[PDB]
A paper describes a structure:
The protein translocon at the endoplasmic reticulum comprises the Sec61 translocation channel and numerous accessory factors that collectively facilitate the biogenesis of secretory and membrane proteins. The central component of this translocon is the Sec61 complex, a heterotrimer containing a channel-forming α subunit and peripheral β and γ subunits. Sec61α is a pseudosymmetric channel that can open axially across the membrane and is laterally gated towards the lipid bilayer. Three factors are linked to co-translational Sec61-mediated secretion: TRAM, TRAP, and RAMP4 (also called SERP1, known as Ysy6 in yeast). Both TRAP and RAMP4 are tightly associated near-stoichiometrically with ER-localised ribosome-Sec61 complexes from pancreas, an exceptionally secretory tissue.
Author numbering:
A (entry chain C): 55 to 319
B (entry chain Y): 1 to 134
C (entry chain L): 2 to 159
Amino acid sequence: SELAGHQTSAESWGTGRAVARIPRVRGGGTHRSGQGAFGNMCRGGRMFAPTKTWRRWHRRVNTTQKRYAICSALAASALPALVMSKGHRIEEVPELPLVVEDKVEGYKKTKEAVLLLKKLKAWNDIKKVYASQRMRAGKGKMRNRRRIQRRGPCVIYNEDNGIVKAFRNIPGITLLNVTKLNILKLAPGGHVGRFCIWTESAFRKLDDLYGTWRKAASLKSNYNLPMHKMLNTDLSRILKSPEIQRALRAPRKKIHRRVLKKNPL
Amino acid sequence: MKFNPFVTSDRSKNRKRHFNAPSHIRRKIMSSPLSKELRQKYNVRSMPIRKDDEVQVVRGHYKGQQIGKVVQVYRKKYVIYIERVQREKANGTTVHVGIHPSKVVITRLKLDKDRKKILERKAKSRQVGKEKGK
Amino acid sequence: APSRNGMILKPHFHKDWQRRVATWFNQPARKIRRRKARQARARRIAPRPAAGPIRPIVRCPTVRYHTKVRAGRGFSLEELRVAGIHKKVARTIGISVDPRRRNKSTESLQANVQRLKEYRSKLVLFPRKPSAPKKGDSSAEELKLATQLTGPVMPIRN
RNA sequence: CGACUCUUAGCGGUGGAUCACUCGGCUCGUGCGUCGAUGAAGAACGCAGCUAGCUGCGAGAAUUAAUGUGAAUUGCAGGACACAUUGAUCAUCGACACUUCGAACGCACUUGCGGCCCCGGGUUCCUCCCGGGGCUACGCCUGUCUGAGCGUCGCU
RNA sequence: GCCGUCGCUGGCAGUCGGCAGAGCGAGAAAGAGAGUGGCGCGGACGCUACGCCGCGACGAGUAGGAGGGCCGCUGCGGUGAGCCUUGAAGCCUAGGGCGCGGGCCCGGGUGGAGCCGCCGCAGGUGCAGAUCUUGGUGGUAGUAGCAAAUAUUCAAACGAGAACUUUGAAGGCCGAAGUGGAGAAGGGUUCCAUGUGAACAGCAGUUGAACAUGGGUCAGUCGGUCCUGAGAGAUGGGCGAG
RNA sequence: UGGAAUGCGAGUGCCUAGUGGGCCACUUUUGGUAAGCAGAACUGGCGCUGCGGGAUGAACCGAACGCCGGGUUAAGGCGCC
RNA sequence: ACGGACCAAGGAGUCUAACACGUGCGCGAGUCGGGGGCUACGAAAGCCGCCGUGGCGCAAUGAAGGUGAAGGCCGGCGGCGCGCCGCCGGCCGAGGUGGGAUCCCGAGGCCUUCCAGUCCGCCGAGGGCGCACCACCGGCCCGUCUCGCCCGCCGCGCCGG
RNA sequence: CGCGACCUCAGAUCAGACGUGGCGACCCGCUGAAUUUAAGCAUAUUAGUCAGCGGAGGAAAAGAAACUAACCAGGAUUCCCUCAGUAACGGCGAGUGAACAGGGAAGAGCCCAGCGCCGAAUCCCCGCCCCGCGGCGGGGCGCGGGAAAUGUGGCGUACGGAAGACCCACUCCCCGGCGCCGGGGGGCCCAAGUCCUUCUGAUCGAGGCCCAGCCCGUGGACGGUGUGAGGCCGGUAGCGGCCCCCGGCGCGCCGGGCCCGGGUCUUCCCGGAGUCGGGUUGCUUGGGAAUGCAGCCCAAAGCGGGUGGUAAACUCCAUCUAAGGCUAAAUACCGGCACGAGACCGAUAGUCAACAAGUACCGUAAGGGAAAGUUGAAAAGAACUUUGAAGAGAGAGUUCAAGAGGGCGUGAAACCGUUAAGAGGUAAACGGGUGGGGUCCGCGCAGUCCGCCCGGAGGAUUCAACCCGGCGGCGCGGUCCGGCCGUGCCGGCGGGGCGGAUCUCCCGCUCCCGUCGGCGGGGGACCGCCCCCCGGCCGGCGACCGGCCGCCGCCGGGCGCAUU
Ligand SMILES: [Mg+2]
Ligand SMILES: [Mg+2]
Ligand SMILES: [Mg+2]
Ligand SMILES: [Mg+2]
Ligand SMILES: [Mg+2]
Ligand SMILES: [Mg+2]
Ligand SMILES: [Mg+2]
Ligand SMILES: [Mg+2]
Ligand SMILES: [Mg+2]
Ligand SMILES: [Mg+2]
Ligand SMILES: [Mg+2]
Ligand SMILES: [Mg+2]
Ligand SMILES: [Mg+2]
Ligand SMILES: [Mg+2]
Ligand SMILES: [Mg+2]
Ligand SMILES: [Mg+2]
Ligand SMILES: [Mg+2]
Ligand SMILES: [Mg+2]
Ligand SMILES: [Mg+2]
Ligand SMILES: [Mg+2]
Ligand SMILES: [Mg+2]
Ligand SMILES: [Mg+2]
Ligand SMILES: [Mg+2]
Ligand SMILES: [Mg+2]
Ligand SMILES: [Mg+2]
Ligand SMILES: [Mg+2]
Ligand SMILES: [Mg+2]
Ligand SMILES: [Mg+2]
Ligand SMILES: [Mg+2]
Ligand SMILES: [Mg+2]
Ligand SMILES: [Mg+2]
Ligand SMILES: [Mg+2]
Ligand SMILES: [Mg+2]
Ligand SMILES: [Mg+2]
Ligand SMILES: [Mg+2]
Ligand SMILES: [Mg+2]
Ligand SMILES: [Mg+2]
Ligand SMILES: [Mg+2]
Ligand SMILES: [Mg+2]
Ligand SMILES: [Mg+2]
Ligand SMILES: [Mg+2]
Ligand SMILES: [Mg+2]
Ligand SMILES: [Mg+2]
Ligand SMILES: [Mg+2]
Ligand SMILES: [Mg+2]
Ligand SMILES: [Mg+2]
Ligand SMILES: [Mg+2]
Ligand SMILES: [Mg+2]
Ligand SMILES: [Mg+2]
Ligand SMILES: [Mg+2]
Ligand SMILES: [Mg+2]
Ligand SMILES: [Mg+2]
Ligand SMILES: [Mg+2]
Ligand SMILES: [Mg+2]
Ligand SMILES: [Mg+2]
Ligand SMILES: [Mg+2]
Ligand SMILES: [Mg+2]
Ligand SMILES: [Mg+2]
Ligand SMILES: [Mg+2]
Ligand SMILES: [Mg+2]
Ligand SMILES: [Mg+2]
Ligand SMILES: [Mg+2]
Ligand SMILES: [Mg+2]
Ligand SMILES: [Mg+2]
Ligand SMILES: [Mg+2]
Ligand SMILES: [Mg+2]
Ligand SMILES: [Mg+2]
Ligand SMILES: [Mg+2]
Ligand SMILES: [Mg+2]
Ligand SMILES: [Mg+2]
Ligand SMILES: [Mg+2]
Ligand SMILES: [Mg+2]
Ligand SMILES: [Mg+2]
Ligand SMILES: [Mg+2]
Ligand SMILES: [Mg+2]
Ligand SMILES: [Mg+2]
Ligand SMILES: [Mg+2]
Ligand SMILES: [Mg+2]
């Protein structure tokens, strides 16, 4: 409150009365009389630099960068090492990316959804979300944040014909409309490599949504994939190649430690 | 997950409305499940506990198979008093212990005109949803 | 105090500017409200166009903008007179009227006169009494195809 | 020896920090956006079987009626020929009710003085006394009634 | 000897293995070059390259600057198939250790319901001071003090209990401008009866103006009520943004 | 024949805090009887700095500092403390 | 010299705006949707492209009216007397000097029994193209001054170049 | 003198109405500082801001040009973005500071006086009759009263309007009643474990619940319940169910009102005065020879007047039409009623106020104004015995625990009592160095472990090599077959999308006589790019594989039966 600590008529007694010069409450007959006020070192006073509602809570991020961030997330989502390293149990999914037929877009019952995840071997990831359900340490419990769990697989669909309702009650699952992908969902916590599951229709719109290298995006007015700074990231193939290996001087791997000086005299 | 914009899941709002519930609401809150026999017969799962019902205690120190009659629905304290569910004070007199209605099972319902009206409505609503899934 | 090279700045914060800060935390809630009033209005006047009355073409003033045209307030009495539309009947059938505007040159006058005639050619007019058509009303066959229009009517383009 | 003093530790006090909790705040957003002479806001004083405060209510006073609800309220007691269409309790709230002051209104602010009309009891029609009921404030608009003027006129 | 800093913008992708051949520190340019004619199945560690290794020099610090913190605090997104009623946080500890340090780990005890590690995000984030704020506690200290207005004593009663209460008897004082009997203003139940002796009455108390439970103020004639005083104050009127 | 010796890697650009009371000593030096006084030059100090010595001490003399072992010193010392 | 008897808890460079430079990322002569609109977490996220209006940048200079960012060579003609100016057609062309990381050529030279002469490498006097950057000298655009001769025309001018 | 009209003005407890006061976050009209900055201070700034006064509503105000402009023109008001920290103001210092155009949100326009014409065609009130009657209205009747010619109603208002004539075309538009038909508020309800072992004071904990995977799930929000709960309860999900009430939108009947329009000609008519403008004064603005407002003086005109950002004269242009009025929306909202949320605070924090808080208490008063949360799962809140006058104790009992005993969760520090140990004349404390003693720890006290080898005792799912099967790695298979496949290159009658400031028979509207041209709207060709199809070269398969063959390795099963 802009009033916190200021709803009094406190006034400094001045010097000469053998007390600090902090402004003091007026009147008498109660405990509050003669106590310190206002200052941030006082009990019941006004804090230092009171917080303001016009703190700059919101940030602009360039569209070109936000789209970049969605391409990085999708690229990372297709590498087993990164999806494993994100904690997902995808040790038995048949392939990455995992593309399922468009029939799953029309499911209605949660049991159809649970059964599919068990046949795709995405159910060990669900069971890890159940095992990670627990209480939150700290005041978040007092503030409608009592329970915490880890994110599960992400299900990406082209059109919702009951897939959202068929999946929404399974803990950890997040649905995403392929034409409205979100970085906060594809990279929870800021870390790339969330395990995702595509329907066929969703998987076939990615080229249109973000364009290939040869063909600009069709569903974005002017966009194309971000160019590669380094085309061959296999540093070991590059270094071991004959061409580089002919230009190098022989390695100097002999270690010349310090010689203890003995007196020639 | 809850989607109704006008239903709060706030912890403190929900607790204030529980502990300040008016009597006719505390009644609904003070509901008990039915035995497997009663559940099958009436196609109802839970009933608002009432005086002269006969219940089993299924949790706590006084749990067991002893069927006792409900002798008092102390709504202010959110507890019911049951026959033989009691103990002694220092001076040796006997005093009832308060069991929460949610920790008993109703084995016989004190039936009258209004209880039957309540029972039929709950089953009629249940059967409607049954035929919605079919 | 100034310190080495720097711009000389004159911030306008010598009043009680904190008493009159206008935050924008209701912006998304304003945008929803405005949209929800556009939808309830589109339903209310359907099949009439949601955008509203058809606006005319006008050339922007000044030498900085006179190369461009845009949508004006409403068609002028000379324009409506040449197009054979009564000024009081114009608003009833989706046409906007601007008694203030003057036609200085013919070509601009003609452009709006033709715009009116094109609009009158696309107008699908429902009879006042549905069971009792009248002289100017559209045939029953072309009333089954009457659907509400989205966006400005006959958009103006440079 | 031992008192006394110091340091450390165990236990016990003084004290109420810390931690955990939160029917309270604060901030943002949304819908509505409603007081009063038909007496508002506010104030005073009363009202419970046992009740000081908080709370609610107004001499019908921790409430009446009605509707919904369907067996309590509960600290103790009690049960009206209270309690299952002879409806406990709670909720709702459209019927009825709403002491004194207060713009506050018969005049004044001391529970001080009237006046007008009607009614009832005193006695015994009038008076007179007692009691009750209704009126009796300022400004202002429309109309009404009653008037004023060596204001302007007409007929006498 | 060891720690760190700085420099060498030093070295290591050559772990090139039986599809093999181990080197390039050496005073002094550039190829351990390529050719054409005249039995066993074996061989340590390394390389979070933001990592590892080597060699040389150096190291004072207020005001001030910068770097790194696997220093610490609270909340948010991820993650730890994390911990926890077979015991969380907190608190205590002549227990065992780690780190230059900020600090941290483990043992034991108490406690009774939640907490923490890592990658990021955020901040109302680190106290010895400000005659700092609020709260608590010391020494001083069983100390200053309980000294203005002449004064008490004897016997009995109740009572666990008596210098202080009550009754009796003495001796004294106020000395009718009173320490007497009544009122106005103010107080507001302090009045009266009975009970208690926790707190209060700066010792005590069986007592009290304390506390507790109940009572008590009766009018034509006593005042108010009425009059007007100094004055205050409506309407008419005047002023006045109001 | 990079045209004296000696030593040393240089150049360059942005942003920048604190400071803007000083004080002391050899030598030189103004005012003053003089002052642990006031005011200057040069260099070095104290301030910001510990350490051995001057018993004691801001500045004197020696010497400047990571945590240590051995050796040797400086200025100063070696009756006893 | 001043504050400090003791203990706990609280306690002081924050947030908004503007600017400067440094660093990181995106795109790049462009770039930015921040306002608007479309389509539980979500008040988020996604899209617009005839929503880029607009901001900043891409042009400076002057008070302003305003103006507003390389040249040379060849041939012919005209005026003056081989040279100068005005006018016509063809050729080349965004300066140069010094330094300058890197790059390039290569006299000579890098061995094995001995001669010849090859393929790939590698060192190298000397010589080149020279990035950025700096110093210097030219040039171009706007204001002003001095000198001076011409060229244009629907307006023959107190015109314009 | 008297009577009677009107005018002006009075009195009524005359009949019927209306205003007053409060709240005030947002709004409108006034009045209005000084702290402060200028490193002093006086203009300036603070600031048209605090304080003061008045008046409202759900919004208020504003608002349909006496506007902006100077363009090829725009076209009410309000709000957002930008214009723009700009034009401008300013001891030209400190500082201050708009508008037009442009893009959006929203979008709505209208009415008088006057000039006229209509027999005042107009209105209010009273009584009776019919309908309705908790928004007091509609119709019929009254030689019922009144207002109104000092001007009510119809037409009509600057976009022009009226009247007459000729053409053309017209039947639904509303008002009061009456009946029938398809969003909002309130109530009641609707899935699934208290299954089996088990820890516990109690558990919602842990393990299990056949192939499959306890059961529901459009419900795994939240809260309660003796931990910690999708399944025990309430709820949560659901274009879920039922029941009441209000509303809205439609369809018919009765009685009413309106007797309604457009084009062209002809004749007519047309505007707001102590206001504008001017002078001066004071305030105000960015507004500068004066932006706006006000006082005083002067005081208009009618092809006039206002504006056209430097005073003034002459002159052209442009542009509006002042001095009367109404008007939703987009916009504002720290008060109110009712809700939802939060990277917020967590009892010295967060509101002063988590609680009998604007309370106790202080002040004559205006005013000032706290402290203060927590036993336990459940009161099971300690019967009874005994000492004491009692407070207090000792036993006993409840509880998992009183080592939780009614200001009781935990229970720190300072400070204090006591027990134990050590020590004590330069106050205590402190750094370095040892020493002695204690508390505990090593859960020490005949002292490590590993590989290979030698030798003794033994003992076996017995080794190598071979055969069968499976799997894997590699192959320059010097050049095996099949594949996808090149951000590769060539040939295509290849079948298409995207873009183009590259060119070009069909159509809509319009100028011209049925003709001929321009705008706008469409094919087609062309070029650049892309995808899909077919043939040829080289090309990957290490972000991208199959079949055979070969080599090697590994495993399973045989056989090897023992100097392994
Ligand atoms: Mg506070
Ligand atoms: Mg914590
Ligand atoms: Mg249920
Ligand atoms: Mg400075
Ligand atoms: Mg009472
Ligand atoms: Mg009732
Ligand atoms: Mg009832
Ligand atoms: Mg009086
Ligand atoms: Mg240092
Ligand atoms: Mg200690
Ligand atoms: Mg607890
Ligand atoms: Mg915080
Ligand atoms: Mg402190
Ligand atoms: Mg004494
Ligand atoms: Mg007396
Ligand atoms: Mg007396
Ligand atoms: Mg005493
Ligand atoms: Mg007394
Ligand atoms: Mg008497
Ligand atoms: Mg009087
Ligand atoms: Mg007066
Ligand atoms: Mg100074
Ligand atoms: Mg000196
Ligand atoms: Mg001096
Ligand atoms: Mg100093
Ligand atoms: Mg120094
Ligand atoms: Mg020194
Ligand atoms: Mg000496
Ligand atoms: Mg030494
Ligand atoms: Mg000595
Ligand atoms: Mg001082
Ligand atoms: Mg002191
Ligand atoms: Mg602290
Ligand atoms: Mg700067
Ligand atoms: Mg930058
Ligand atoms: Mg939200
Ligand atoms: Mg009256
Ligand atoms: Mg000043
Ligand atoms: Mg100052
Ligand atoms: Mg001053
Ligand atoms: Mg001002
Ligand atoms: Mg104000
Ligand atoms: Mg007021
Ligand atoms: Mg008012
Ligand atoms: Mg209102
Ligand atoms: Mg209005
Ligand atoms: Mg406008
Ligand atoms: Mg700008
Ligand atoms: Mg000046
Ligand atoms: Mg100003
Ligand atoms: Mg504009
Ligand atoms: Mg719009
Ligand atoms: Mg008229
Ligand atoms: Mg007009
Ligand atoms: Mg629970
Ligand atoms: Mg389980
Ligand atoms: Mg639960
Ligand atoms: Mg379960
Ligand atoms: Mg349910
Ligand atoms: Mg629901
Ligand atoms: Mg007008
Ligand atoms: Mg003023
Ligand atoms: Mg001003
Ligand atoms: Mg001018
Ligand atoms: Mg208005
Ligand atoms: Mg507290
Ligand atoms: Mg408090
Ligand atoms: Mg507080
Ligand atoms: Mg406290
Ligand atoms: Mg705390
Ligand atoms: Mg506590
Ligand atoms: Mg315990
Ligand atoms: Mg405890
Ligand atoms: Mg508890
Ligand atoms: Mg406590
Ligand atoms: Mg305690
Ligand atoms: Mg002790
Ligand atoms: Mg001792």
